[PDB]
Amino acid sequence: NECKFKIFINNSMATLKKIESNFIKQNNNVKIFAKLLFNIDSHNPKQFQLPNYITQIDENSIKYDFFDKIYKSKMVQKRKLFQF
């Protein structure tokens, strides 16, 4: 994957331009980790070790998700007034 990565981007194309600057518009439910998904081919796999110390449809998707979140918020408010 390392050979593909360079031959694809690291050689002569979009060295200064950020590739992962426009993947937000097509990817949903990706908020916490975003930068580490781009360079998944830049590191070679290795064996297991352990240290000795150890946007149209996306708007609709987030709108229905937030509707479900609001209904759940109402439900936990009912639960907390029941338990209080």
Partner 1 sequence: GGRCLAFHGPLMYEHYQGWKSSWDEWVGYDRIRAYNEENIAMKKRLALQIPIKLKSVLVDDWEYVTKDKKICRLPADVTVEMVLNKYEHEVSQELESPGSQSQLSEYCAGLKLYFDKCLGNMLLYRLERLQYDELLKKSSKDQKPLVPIRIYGAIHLLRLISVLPELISSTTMDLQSCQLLIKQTEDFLVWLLMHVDE
Partner 2 sequence: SRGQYSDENDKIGQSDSYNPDTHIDSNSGKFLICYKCNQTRLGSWSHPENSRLIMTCDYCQTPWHLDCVPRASFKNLGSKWKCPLHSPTKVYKKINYKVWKKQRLINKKNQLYYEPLQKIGYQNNGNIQIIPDFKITQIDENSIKYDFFDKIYKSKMV
Amino acid symbol at 83: Q
From 4-12, 27-35, 39-47, span contacting partner 2 (CB under 8 A): 27-35
Interactions with partner 1, residue window 46-75 (CB under 8 A): 46-48, 50, 53-54, 65, 69, 72-73, 75
Residues after which the chain has a gap (C–N > 2.5 Å):
54
Shortest reach from residue 6's CB to partner 1, in Å: 17
Give the residue carrying structure tokens 């907390």. Answer: 80
Distance separating alpha carbons of residues 56 and 63, to the nearest angstrom:
11
Residues that bind partner 2 (CB under 8 A): 24, 31-32, 34-35, 62, 66, 70, 73
